Amino acid sequence: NPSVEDEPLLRENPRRFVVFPIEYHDIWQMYKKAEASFWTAEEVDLSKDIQHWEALKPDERHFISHVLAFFAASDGIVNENLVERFSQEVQVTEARCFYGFQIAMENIHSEMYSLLIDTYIKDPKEREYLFNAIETMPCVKKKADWALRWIGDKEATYGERVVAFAAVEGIFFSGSFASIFWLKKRGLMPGLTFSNELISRDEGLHCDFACLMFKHLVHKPAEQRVREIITNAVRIEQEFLTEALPVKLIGMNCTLMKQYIEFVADRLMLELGFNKIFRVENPFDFME
């Protein structure tokens, strides 16, 4: 390999397989924060929610079910990206650790969503419909396809793929994470919202890490390119939350939801070392 041979993160250097002669304390500290946040789905008590789900309005259940549909496999995709690309291509021991843990936690998120979906939708029909939302519901498909693309895209560089996946884990999740936090505020679905809390704290960590990898990348995509992969994520996430599945359904103001998504992308841009794109304030007090 050429250009790669000059990238600390990817260079075939290791000639080691050991951990303590610690090379990057920043990457290491990130792996430690994650190890510290370990949790199992068994910990989220879903016993009640089954009826909480009943107390809901039809438009709300519609909403929450479509949102779950998406979360049902995305953390699937992620782990399929991390095991056949990142945790691989990267040869820095501290980063492979962070990545080994991320994969373990994505399979737990993945499990969490399923339990959710099983606890709420008992009629088998719907259940299968939601489980295979990747191939049944357009909107989510137009999402899963995006993250699914950077996996097999044989052309994109690790620089571009890290950003894109940061967009998937932060922008593609921010929409729903915000709306789920809304419910919590409004006193609804404590099993949903509690799980949504643990998981969100993980995705936050998975993005900062992605950003951190980006910053250890030498030859990275130009700002304009990054701005465009992020911007596109914003549009696909917006369209999703104020069109194919309007947050109106749970009583939220689309226009503000949009502004939030942008505020999120702005925070992602800072993290990556660039300027804000949209320059808009985070409109939800319970999010800032």
Next chain:
Amino acid sequence: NPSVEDEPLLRENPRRFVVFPIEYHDIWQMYKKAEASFWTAEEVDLSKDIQHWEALKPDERHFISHVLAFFAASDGIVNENLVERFSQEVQVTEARCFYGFQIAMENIHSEMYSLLIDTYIKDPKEREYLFNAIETMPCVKKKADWALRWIGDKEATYGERVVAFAAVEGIFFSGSFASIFWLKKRGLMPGLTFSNELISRDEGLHCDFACLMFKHLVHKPAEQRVREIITNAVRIEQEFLTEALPVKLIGMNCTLMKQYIEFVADRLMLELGFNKIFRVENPFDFME
């Protein structure tokens, strides 16, 4: 792909990425046992050992240091096998889960050994010597090379590679796990032996799982082939523990150590569904 298209474990079937429509409860139960056994190195208290290491005899420290040398990277190799082969080639959600966890736990074992090595060898010279034992100490190299081979071996089949790695995780570790348990018995090195307890319980689980994968493999290697990959592991592990690093050094009877290694391989053969090879009793009461 041909033959593979007919293997449940490897067939490009998924078209899912979700976990709850649970297909194999046996593989699932194995992933749950593992999730349940989670532990962090932070949990092993090494505060004392530094001097316990001093109370030891020179031949014993020699022994324990060379044994650590090996454990310093093997769990490195394993995870490099699991991320760029098994967790990949396998498409069964329950198995990828077990594998996501195994990788997370191997990076912790990997960390555990380093902490050990740092706590015991303070002089930097030795320390680097042991950390790079893969390229410094023959005997271990003749071990790491074996597991390292089935990783890049482009010819071997997933059937053969599962057995071989089961040989690496059970036979290549049994020797040292036995001798470390000896010390525990004889009142020595509680930090070493305690960590050696947690880790051993994991490798046991990693082998049964490997065996379990083998049993879900349709078209597998013939018994003779399996007998030979296992037998070879026995010889390389024996030679190591009664030649290049005789258990004599910690007061153990080589001849019996050999018999143990065979008893271990026999238990591995049963597990895989075959007949015992050696037919010898497990000689250590504290192991059977």
